[PDB]
Amino acid sequence: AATGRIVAVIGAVVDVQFDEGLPPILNALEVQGRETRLVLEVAQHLGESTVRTIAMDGTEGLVRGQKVLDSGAPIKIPVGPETLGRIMNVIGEPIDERGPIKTKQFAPIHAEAPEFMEMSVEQEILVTGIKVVDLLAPYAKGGKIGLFGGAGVGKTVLIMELINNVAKAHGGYSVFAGVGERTREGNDLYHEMIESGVINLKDATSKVALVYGQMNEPPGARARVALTGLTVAEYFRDQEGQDVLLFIDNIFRFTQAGSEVSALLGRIPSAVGYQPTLATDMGTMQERITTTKKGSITSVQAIYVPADDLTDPAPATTFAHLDATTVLSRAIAELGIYPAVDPLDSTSRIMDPNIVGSEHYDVARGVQKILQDYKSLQDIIAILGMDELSEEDKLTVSRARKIQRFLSQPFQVAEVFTGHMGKLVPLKETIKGFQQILAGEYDHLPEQAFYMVGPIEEAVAKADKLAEEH
Amino acid sequence: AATGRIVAVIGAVVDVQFDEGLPPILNALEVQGRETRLVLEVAQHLGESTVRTIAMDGTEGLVRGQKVLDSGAPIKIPVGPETLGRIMNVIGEPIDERGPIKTKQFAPIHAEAPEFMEMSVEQEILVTGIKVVDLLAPYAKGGKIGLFGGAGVGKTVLIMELINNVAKAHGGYSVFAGVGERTREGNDLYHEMIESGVINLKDATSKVALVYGQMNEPPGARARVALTGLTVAEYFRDQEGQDVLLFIDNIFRFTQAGSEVSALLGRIPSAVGYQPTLATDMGTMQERITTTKKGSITSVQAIYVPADDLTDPAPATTFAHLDATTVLSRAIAELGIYPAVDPLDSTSRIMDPNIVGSEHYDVARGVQKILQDYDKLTVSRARKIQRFLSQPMGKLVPLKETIKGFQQILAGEYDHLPEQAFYMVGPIEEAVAKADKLAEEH
Amino acid sequence: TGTAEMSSILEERILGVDLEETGRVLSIGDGIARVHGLRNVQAEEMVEFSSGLKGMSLNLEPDNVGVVVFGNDKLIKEGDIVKRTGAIVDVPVGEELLGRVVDALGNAIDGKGPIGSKTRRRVGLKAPGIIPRISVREPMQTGIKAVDSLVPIGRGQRELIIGDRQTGKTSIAIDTIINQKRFNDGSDEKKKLYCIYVAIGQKRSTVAQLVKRLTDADAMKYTIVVSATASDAAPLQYLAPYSGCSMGEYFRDNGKHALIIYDDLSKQAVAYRQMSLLLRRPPGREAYPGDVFYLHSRLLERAAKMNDAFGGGSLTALPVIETQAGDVSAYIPTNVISITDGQIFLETELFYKGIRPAINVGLSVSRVGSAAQTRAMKQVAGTMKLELAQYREVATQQLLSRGVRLTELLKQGQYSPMAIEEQVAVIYAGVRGYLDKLEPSKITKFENAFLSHVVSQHQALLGTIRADGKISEQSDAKLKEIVTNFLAGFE
Amino acid sequence: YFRDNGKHALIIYDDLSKQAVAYRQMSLLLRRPPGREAYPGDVFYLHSRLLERAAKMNDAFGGGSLTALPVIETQAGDVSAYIPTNVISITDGQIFLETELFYKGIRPAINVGLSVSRVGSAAQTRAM
Amino acid sequence: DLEETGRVLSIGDGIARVHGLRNVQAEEMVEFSSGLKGMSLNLEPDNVGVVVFGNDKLIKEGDIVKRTGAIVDVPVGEELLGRVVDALGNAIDGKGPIGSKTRRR
Amino acid sequence: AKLVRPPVQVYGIEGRYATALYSAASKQNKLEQVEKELLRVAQILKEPKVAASVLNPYVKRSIKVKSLNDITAKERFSPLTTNLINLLAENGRLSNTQGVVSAFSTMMSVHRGEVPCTVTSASPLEEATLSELKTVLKSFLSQGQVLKLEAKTDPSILGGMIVRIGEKYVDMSVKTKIQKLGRAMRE
Ligand SMILES: Nc1ncnc2c1ncn2[C@@H]1O[C@H](COP(=O)(O)OP(=O)(O)OP(=O)(O)O)[C@@H](O)[C@H]1O
Ligand SMILES: Nc1ncnc2c1ncn2[C@@H]1O[C@H](COP(=O)(O)OP(=O)(O)O)[C@@H](O)[C@H]1O
Ligand SMILES: Nc1ncnc2c1ncn2[C@@H]1O[C@H](COP(=O)(O)OP(=O)(O)O)[C@@H](O)[C@H]1O
Ligand SMILES: [Mg+2]
Ligand SMILES: [Mg+2]
Ligand SMILES: [Mg+2]
C-alpha cells in the first residue's frame, strides 16, 4: 500500500508525510527498519499530505525520513477462544512466550458502540460476598461497576477479592485488562490464575484472557490497551452470546495517557490540564463496555483518583458511566477499616425497594442514616467530647461506631495483612446482622467485637472471647 | 458612505475589510442584505484595512464577502420626550409594537463624561420611606445608589418598590435600563407600570422610558444597552434641565457582557476572567452619571454579585462608583426578613451629622453598633431591631417617624413587647398594635 | 504560517472546480475539519461531506472554514469534497413525536419506524420578546410535596434543578413527567402538559432504563425523548437542547403547554467547551469559552408563557446542573443560577439523613412563588414556609419540634407523585397542630395511613377541593372533622 | 547491569521529588501545559517508567534483582499531594516517617500504623 | 522623514502600534496628529507600542505621530499650590494656566 | 492533486512558496527558465524606489500589486512567475519574496547536483594545494555532482584546515588537536 516518510518525532507523536495514498484516521502504520514491530496510529490530518500519529511503542532511534508503511486498516488483534489463557499487548502480540495466537479472525480495536435498540434493561443483584458492597451498594449482573480510590487505599485488593469470588464462581469467559498498572501485579495475577486452574497451560480449557499495557509503556500503548481488552470482551459477548466478565485496572490511566499525548498533538489544554476531548474519548470507550440484547458484560473497573480529589475531571467524568460506584476513602483506611469503602459515597442503581426488597432497602437506608448522624456529630464530639452529647446522641454514636466496625471484613487475599482468614458473608447474614445492630440487640457488646469479623455470629463469639479472656 | 466586506465571522465577532474610508473605533456599521437591522460596533483596528467588530444581534447567516455600510458615527438612538413610555433596544428601535419613535433629535451612545468644572457639590437627601434604607444608608438626590446582591436576595423586588414609590412621587422623567435581565420580569414590569398609570398608551403623559437588552442577546448588546439608557437620561438632563432618575438593572450584566466581549476580542484575560479593560470601561460608563450644573441624574443601580462574594472584580470595581450603596445579603434573606439589606455592609455618604442631623446620625450609629455586638437585654433589643428593620399590605414610614421608633426600641421603651411583634410592620404604632392583638389572643 | 498557505493550494494557484458552493478539506482532526473554499457558506450553515457526514460552519475565517463534524472523523480525509446544502439546522416537530425516542437531529432511534410529522422547525430560532408574553399564572404540578408547596413552579417558568451527583435530580424530573398522567388522561385540554426529556451526555443504558420507567408508568404516549448520549459527537450533544426546545416550541406556539427537561446542561457546556477549544477560540474561566453564558441564556430564554393573542401556549424548562462538591461558586452553576427563575437545590447530607427528596428549602427559591400555586396550597404553604424558616434559624422548643414535624412531613418516596388535593390534606393535618402529639418517627406512618383513609372515605371532599381549587369554609370544617377523627383513631 | 547478570543491586533515589521539580522546570521551559501544581501531564510516567525497572527476575533470566528505595519529601506531612500519591501508586509500600515522632525522641520515626509493605511477609526469615 | 515621524499602523483599546520613529527613545512622549499625546513604552523591531493619553475614537490607522525629544516631564514649583491639575500638570480648575517656571521628569 | 517534492526541503513561508513554484515548474519542464525569471524579478525589487513602493504598509494592496502587474507585464513574464508575484501580494507576503527567490536558488542547485564545501584555514591558501584538495574533495561525491568550494580563512585555528562538505565535516585543525591532547594529558 502507501509508503511515507517520518518528518518529525516528538515523544510518542510522529508526523508522517505521504507522497500518495494518505491513510484514513485511526489506521495502523508500520515503521520500517526496526528490530521490534513499532505501530503508529493515525490521529489527525495536518494537510500537506502529512498525518500526525501516536506511537504504540518507543520512538527512540527514529530518524527523520525513515520509511513508514500503511496497513490499510486500524489495529487488528486476534479474537476468539484461542485468546483464553494468553497474555497479549496493545497490538495483539503474545507476551507470554507461548507462540502465536492462532485465531480464525481478527477484530479492529476501534468499533462503534451498540445502538440504543440493543440496550438491555434487566437488573439482577450480583452477590459478591462483601458486606458493605452487598448492603449499601449492591452490584448488578451485566452492569458497569467501577471502584474509585486514591493511591494505596485498596483498589487492587478489592478488585482481586471480586476476581476471586465472582470470577471463580463464574462460567463465562472473564477478561482482564491491565492498563497502566504494576507489571509485578500482572505477573502475580498470571501465576495465581495458573495455580488456581483458571488458566490452563495445557489441554486448553481456560476461561480468562489477559491484556496488559502497564506503567512502563509509552502513552500510546497505555491509551489503547483498554480498547484492546474491550475488543476481546466485545467478541466474547456478541459473536458468542456468552456472559462475559470484564475487569479493567486501572482505567484512569487511559485518560491520563490521552492527556500526556494531547499536548504534543497541538491542542489547547482544557481545565486542570487534561485534553479538551476528555469526555468524548471516555464516552466512545465506555459506551462499548455494555450489556446488549446479544450478550452480557459485567464490567468492574478500578478508577484512580488523583491526589484524592474526586472532582478531578477524570473521576468526575467517569461517575456518569457506571451503575454501581464503590468509593474508597483514605480517611477510613487510616482508621484501619478494610475495605475502605465510603458508606456515604457509594451508590447503586438497583438500590431500590422494588428490586432488593423492602427489608434490604430499609436496613441499608437506616445504616446510612445512622452513619450520617454520626458524621454530623463528629465535630462537636471532637471539640467538647462525648460527655456533652444527649443520651439519645450517645446511643446513636454507639450504634454508628458499631456499624462502622461491622462494615469491615477480612479479605481472603489480605491474610498477609489482616492475619485473619478471609470471610465470605452471604447476603442474608449481612442484612440480618445489620438489622440487629440497628434494632439495639447488641448495646452491651464492646465495639472492638465487630472489627474484622464475618457474620454477626462471629461478632458475638469475639465479644464472648474478649469478655472471658479480659 | 464607506463600503467594506465581511471577511471573518467567529461567534459574535465580525471582521470587516474596508477598501477606502476606514471607520474609527466605536463606530456603528450596518450589514446589508438582512431582514432585521444588524449593527456591528467597531472595537479594534487590525491593520491592512481590517477592523474587528462586535455584533449587536446574532450573526447566523452572515457570509464572507457580505457588504457592510458605515454609519459614520457611533450608535445613534432617538432621544426626546417621544421616547417616554416606549421600549427601545440597544440600537433605538422600538420593541413594543406601537410604531416608530418620531423624535426630533438623535444622540450617540458614546459621549464623553462631564468635565471637572461642571461638578456639583449639593447633596440633598431623598427619603424613600423604607426604615432600613432611609435609616442606615439613605439616598441622596443626584448621587448614584447601587443595590448589590446575589441571586435570590430581593434586588429586583427592591428596585420595584423603589420604582413605585420614587418614580411615582417624582416629576423628572425617569428612565429604566434593563441590562441583560429576564424577559419574563421585563414583561411583568412593563405591564405593572402600564396599569399603575406610570405609562399611558393613550394621550402620552408617560414619565418613564424603558430600554431593554435582555439575556438572549449577544454580549455586545448587553454591554451597550446601559449606555443606551445613559444616553436617554443624558438627554433628559442636558437639554431638558430635569432631574432624572435612572434605574439600571442589572449592571453586573453589563460587566459580564464586557467579559464576554473581551474573551474573543483578542486580549489577554485579567484576574478571575474579566477583561483587562474592566475598571476603565465601566468608569467611562459610570462617570456620565453625575449631577452637573445643568441637571441631575440620580441612579438606582441593581448589581449582581456572583456567588455572594463582593470581592469579585465587577462588584469591587463598582463599589467606588456609587454614593450610597445598600447591599442585599443572602444570610439575612434566609431569615425571612425583607428587604434583605445588610445593615453592616450598606454605606451612605450623606449619613453624617452635617446633612442628616444629630438625632438621625445617632440612631443610625447606635443601631449599627447594637447589631454588630449582637447583655441578654442587649441581645433582646438587637433581635427586636432586626425584626423592626423589616417592611412588608405595603408600608410607608416617614423619616422622623422611623428615627423615633428605632429610638424607642433602642432606649428600651418597649422591652416588654415580644420579639416578633416588630416583624413585617410599619412604624412603632403598628408594632405595638400587633403586640396588642397577638398578646390578647395568645 | 496560515491555514490556507499549504503548498497544494499555492502551487495550483500559481499554475492556474466551484469554490463558492463547494470546498476541500485542508485538515481534519478531533472532529474539526478546516475547509478551503465554500466562499458562499453562511455562519452556522449545515454542510455535507463526501462520506455522508454533516457539519456546521462555526468558524468563518478569512481563508478557511472551521466546520464541526456530526460524527466520526475516520470517514473524512484531507482533500475530501464538501458541499453546501444552504440551510441552518432544523428538526421535525409535531404531535407525531410523542412516544418516540429521537436523537439530536430528530431521527428515530427506537426502531418503531420513521417519524411521520409534517412540520420542521429551525433550532436557532429566537425567543419571544417582551410583548407576546404574559405573567406566569398557571401551576405546573410536580406531585412532589416539597416542590409544589415550598418551591412552586408555574407554566412558563424556568426552574433549575441543581445538585451534586446522585442526589435525586433525574428522579425529580421523572416524577414531574409521570405526574402529568392525571391531566393528560382527562379531557380538560388546558391542563394537559406534553413533556420533552433531553438526555445530554448520558449512557444509552440510562436512557433505556428511563424510557422503560416512563413506559411502565404509561407516561410515554405524551413524552418525547431527545438523546445525545456520551458516545455521540460533541456537536450533537451541543445541539440536543435546541432540538428539544424547538420540539417544545411547536407546542408552545400552538396553544398547548409543554415541559422540557435538560438533563443536564453541565455536559452540554462540556461539549461546547471541547468544540471551542478545538476551534482555537480563546479559553476563559475553567477553559470554558467566553460565550457560554450566551449559550445557556439563548437556550433558556425560549421558555415562555404566551398571552391569549398569541395562542396562550407555554413552555416550561427544568434545566439540570451538577455541581462538583457542592461548589455553586463555579462557572456554569453561576451562569445558570443567574439565568433561571429559581433553583431546587438538592443536598447530599440531607439525602442520607432520610430527607428524600433531598430538597434544601433554605437554599431553594422560586421567583414566581405563590402566583404559581392553587389557592388551597397557598393557604397551607404560606404558614408552612414561615414555620420552617423560623425553625431553621433556631435549628423555642415549640419551634424546634414543629419544624421537625414538618421536615418528616415533607419526605416522599420515589415514583409516587401525589395529586394536589392530598398534598393539601397532609399539609393541613400537619400545620394546624394535629401532629404535635406524635413523636416524629411516626409522622411517616401517619401520613401513609391518613391518606389511605382520606382517599377511601372522603372522595367527595377531595373532589370539591379539586373542583374549586381552594379550601372552602365548609370544606375547611370537613378537613378538621376528618383529621380530628383520624388522630383520635390513630395509634 | 547487576539485575541482568544474576546479581542483586539496591538503588536509592534521594530524592524523587527533586527530580519531579527538575522535570517540571524543563517542561515549563518547553512551554508544555502545566497540570496540577504546575506539573506536566507525564510526571507519573516520569517516575513510573523508572520505578518499573526495579524487578526480580526468575531463574531463567538469571535470577537477579534490583530493589529501589525512592525517597519522597512531603510538605507539612501532606501525603495526599500529587507527587507523593503518584509514587505511592507506583511503589509496593511506604515507610512513613513522622515529625511528631522524630521530635519526641522516637528515632527512627517510623509510623507503624501507616507504613506498609504490599509484599512483606513473603520476604522475611522464619525467626523474624 | 521616517526617523522623527511615524505613522499609526494599528489601534485598539488604548494601544497605538506606530510604524517608523526610528530615533524615538524608550518612554518618550510623542504627539499624535489630533493633538493627543502618548508615551513610547514598547520599542519593538518593526513598530513602537505607544500608550495614548486619551481615547481611541479620535486617532485612526494612518495618522501621523511626531516626537518631542524629551522624556515625560511635568511642571513643578510653588505655582501649583492651590491648583487642581491632571496627571500631566494641566490645570483643570479653570483658574487659568500654571505659571510654573521649572519642569521636572 | 499530486505534488512534485524537490530533492531538498526548505521551510517557512519561503520554503512553502518555493516548493509550490518548483512543483509547478516540474510539471511543465520550465525550471531554469523560471530561475532566470525570479533572478530578474529579484533585481527588479532590489532597487530602492519601488522596493519602498512595495514594502510600504500604507499602500493599499490593490495599489502595490497594481504597480506589480504593470512592471510584470513590462518584462513579458511567464504566467507562472506573474502568478507567483500576484499570490505574494495577495497574501501580503511580498516583502519576503527575496527569501523565496533565495529558496528556489538553493533548491535547484541541488537539482543540478551541487554540494557546497567550505574550507577554513589559518593561512590564506596557496593555489596549488587549493585545487589539490579540490581534486581530493571530488572523490567523495557520486557522478553528476559539482563542488561549490568556498575557502575562507581564519588565523585562529592555529593551522590545518576545517572542511565542511554540506553537513559532513572534517576538523583537521591544529587548535582542536591541541585541545584533545591537553584533555588526554589531564584525563
Ligand atoms: N425521593 C427519593 N427517595 C428515595 N430515593 C431516591 C429519591 N430520589 C432519588 N432517589 C434515589 O437516589 C439515587 C440517585 O437518584 P438520581 O439518579 O435520580 O439523582 P441524580 O442527580 O440524577 O444522580 P446522577 O449524578 O447519577 O445523575 C437513586 O438511586 C434514586 O433512586
Ligand atoms: N481488604 C483489605 N484488608 C486489609 N488491608 C487492605 C485491604 N485492602 C487494602 N489493604 C491494604 O491497603 C494497601 C493498598 O492496597 P492496594 O489495593 O493494592 O493499593 P491501590 O489503591 O494502589 O490499588 C494494601 O497493601 C493493603 O495493605
Ligand atoms: N413581599 C414579598 N413576599 C414574599 N416574597 C418576596 C416578597 N418580596 C420579595 N420576595 C422574594 O424575594 C426573592 C428575590 O426576588 P428578586 O427580587 O428577583 O431577587 P434578586 O433581584 O435579588 O435576584 C424572591 O424569591 C421573591 O419571592
Ligand atoms: Mg490499582
Ligand atoms: Mg434579578
Ligand atoms: Mg441523572
The three-point CA angle C470-C472-C474 to 5° equals 155
- Determine which one of C367, C375, C432, C466 is catalytic: C367
E-chain CB neighbours of B116 within 8 Å are 84, 92-93
**B48 touches C at CB < 8 Å:** no
Do the Cβ atoms of B24 and E9 come within 8 Å?
Answer: no
Superfamily of domain B76-348: P-loop containing nucleotide triphosphate hydrolases (3.40.50.300)
Burial of B354 (0-12, 13-18, 19+ CB in 10 A): exposed
Do the Cβ atoms of E56 and B25 come within 8 Å?
Answer: yes
Residues 6+ apart with CB under 8 A from C114: C108
Instruction: Of F104, F41, F126, F27, give the one whose Cα is nearest residue F76.
Output: F41
How far does residue D18's CA lie from ligand 4's centre (Å)? 25
Task: Give the atom of ligand 3 at the shortest distance from the alpha carbon of B249.
Answer: 21
At B392, list the grid cell: 412588608
Instruction: Of C346, C347, C286, C353, give the one whose Cα is nearest residue C318.
Output: C346
Q: Give CA–CA dist F82/A282, Å, rounded.
A: 52
Give the N- to C-terminal CA distance of chain C in Å, as an integer.
84
The three-point CA angle B396-B398-B402 to 5° equals 105
Nearest to C74 among A26, A114, A279 (CB): A26
Q: Give CA–CA dist B152/B145, Å, rounded.
A: 20
B-chain CB neighbours of C392 within 8 Å are 334
Instruction: Of D70, D74, D73, D72, give the one whose Cα is nearest residue D53.
Output: D70
Half-sphere exposure of A335 (CA within 13 A, CB side): 18
Evaluate whether A298 touches A248 at the Cβ level (below 8 Å): no
> Does the beta carbon of D115 sit less than 6 angstroms from any atom of ligand 2?
no
> Does the beta carbon of A153 sit less than 6 angstroms from any atom of ligand 2?
yes
Nearest to C16 among F17, F83, F91 (CB): F83
* B358-437 CATH: 1.10.1140.10
The number of beta carbons lying within 10 Å of the beta carbon of residue F60 is 13
Q: Give CA–CA dist A41/A30, Å, rounded.
A: 9
Do the Cβ atoms of C133 and B259 come within 8 Å?
Answer: no
- What's the farthest any 2 CA atoms get from each other in chain F? 70
Ligand 3 shell residues, CB under 6 Å = B 149, 151-157, 328, 338; C 365, 367, 369
Kind and range of the H or E element at F156?
none
Please indicate whether residue C432 is annotated as part of the active site. no
Every domain of chain A and the residues it spans: 3-75, 76-348, 358-465
How far does residue C166's CA lie from ligand 6's centre (Å)? 7
> Does the beta carbon of A417 sit less than 6 angstroms from any atom of ligand 2?
yes
Pocket test for ligand 1, best of A144, A310, A325, A351 (most atoms within 8 A of CB): A351
Q: Give CA–CA dist C334/B418, Å, rounded.
A: 40
Do the Cβ atoms of C352 and A369 come within 8 Å?
Answer: yes
Pairing verdict, β C153-154 and A243-249: unpaired
How far does residue B340's CA lie from ligand 6's centre (Å)? 34
Residue list for the binding site of B for ATP: 152, 154-157, 182
Q: CA–CA distance from D99 to each of A395, C55, D71, D94 (Å)? A: 37, 60, 16, 16
Do the Cβ atoms of C297 and B215 come within 8 Å?
Answer: yes
**Helices F31-45 & F97-109 angle (0-180, nearest 10):** 150
Evaluate whether C46 touches C89 at the Cβ level (below 8 Å): yes
Do the Cβ atoms of B63 and C40 come within 8 Å?
Answer: yes
Q: Give CA–CA dist A371/A352, Å, rounded.
A: 20
Phi, psi at B126, each rounded to 5° = -105, 115
At B207, list the grid cell: 414619565
Say whether E19 sits in a helix, a strand or coil: strand
Mutation target vs F (from C3, C7, C26; most F CBs, 10 A cutoff) = C7
Q: Give CA–CA dist F151/F163, Å, rounded.
A: 9
Question: Residue A9 forms beta bridges with which residues?
Answer: A14
Q: Give CA–CA dist A333/A324, Å, rounded.
A: 21
Do the Cβ atoms of A260 and D41 come within 8 Å?
Answer: yes
**B117 touches E at CB < 8 Å:** yes
> Is C398 known to sit in a ligand binding site?
no
Give the residue numbers in E contacting F (CB under 8 Å), as ranges.
7, 9, 19, 62
Task: Give the atom of ligand 2 at the shortest distance from the alpha carbon of D117.
Answer: 25
Instruction: Of B300, B386, B342, give the one whose Cα is nearest residue B137.
Output: B342
> Does the beta carbon of A338 sit less than 6 angstroms from any atom of ligand 2?
yes
Technique used: cryo-EM
CB pairs < 8 Å spanning A and C: 163
Smallest CA–CA separation between B48 and chain F, in Å? 8
**Helices B278-286 & B219-238 angle (0-180, nearest 10):** 30
Q: Give CA–CA dist B424/B393, Å, rounded.
A: 10
Q: Which domain holds residue C341?
A: 91-376
Q: Report the amino acid identity of residue F47.
A: E
Mutation target vs C (from F21, F31, F38; most C CBs, 10 A cutoff) = F21
Evaluate whether B359 touches B392 at the Cβ level (below 8 Å): no
Evaluate whether F53 touches F64 at the Cβ level (below 8 Å): yes
Question: Residue F118 forms beta bridges with which residues?
Answer: F164
Q: CA–CA distance from C199 to each of A415, C204, C218 (Å)? A: 46, 9, 19
The number of beta carbons lying within 10 Å of the beta carbon of residue C96 is 14
How far does residue C168's CA lie from ligand 6's centre (Å)? 7
Ligand 1 shell residues, CB under 6 Å = A 351-352; C 163, 165-171, 322, 356-357, 412-414
CATH 1.10.1140.10 at A358-465, yes or no: yes
Letter string b/e over residues C283-296, b meaning 16 or more CB atoms within 10 A of that residue's CB = bbbbbbbbbbbbbb
The number of beta carbons lying within 10 Å of the beta carbon of residue C119 is 13
Q: What is the CATH number of the domain that holds F79?
A: 1.10.520.20
Q: Which domain holds residue F38?
A: 12-110
How far, in whole angstroms, is CA B380 from its chain's centroid? 36
Please state whether at least 3 CB pairs lie below 8 Å between chains C and E.
no
Q: Give CA–CA dist A237/A292, Å, rounded.
A: 9
SS3 helix, strand, coil % of chain F, rounded to 5? Answer: 55, 10, 35
The number of beta carbons lying within 10 Å of the beta carbon of residue E102 is 11
Catalytic residue numbers of A read 155, 181-182
- In chain E, residues preceding a discontinuity (C to N beyond 2.5 A) are none
Residues 6+ apart with CB under 8 A from C8: A47, A48, A49, F1, F3
How far does residue C411's CA lie from ligand 1's centre (Å)? 14
Pocket test for ligand 2, best of A303, A417, A423 (most atoms within 8 A of CB): A417
The three-point CA angle C424-C430-C431 to 5° equals 85
F-chain CB neighbours of A46 within 8 Å are none
Q: What is the CATH number of the domain that holds C140?
A: 3.40.50.300
Burial of C444 (0-12, 13-18, 19+ CB in 10 A): middle
* C62 cis-preceded (ω within 30 degrees of 0): no
Question: Residue A13 forms beta bridges with which residues?
Answer: A10, A54
The number of beta carbons lying within 10 Å of the beta carbon of residue C482 is 19
Secondary structure (H, E, C), F112-151? CCEEEEEEEECCCCCHHHHHHHHHHHHCCCCCCCEEEECC
- Please tell me the class of the A3-75 domain: mainly beta
Kind and range of the H or E element at B426?
none
Smallest CA–CA separation between E50 and chain B, in Å? 15
Q: Give CA–CA dist E64/E18, Å, rounded.
A: 9
Give the number of whichever ligand sits closest to the CA of residue C263.
6
Q: CA–CA distance from B387 to each of B336, B341, B423, E53 (Å)? A: 10, 12, 5, 53
CA-nearest residue of chain B to E92? B116
> Does the beta carbon of D31 sit less than 6 angstroms from any atom of ligand 2?
no
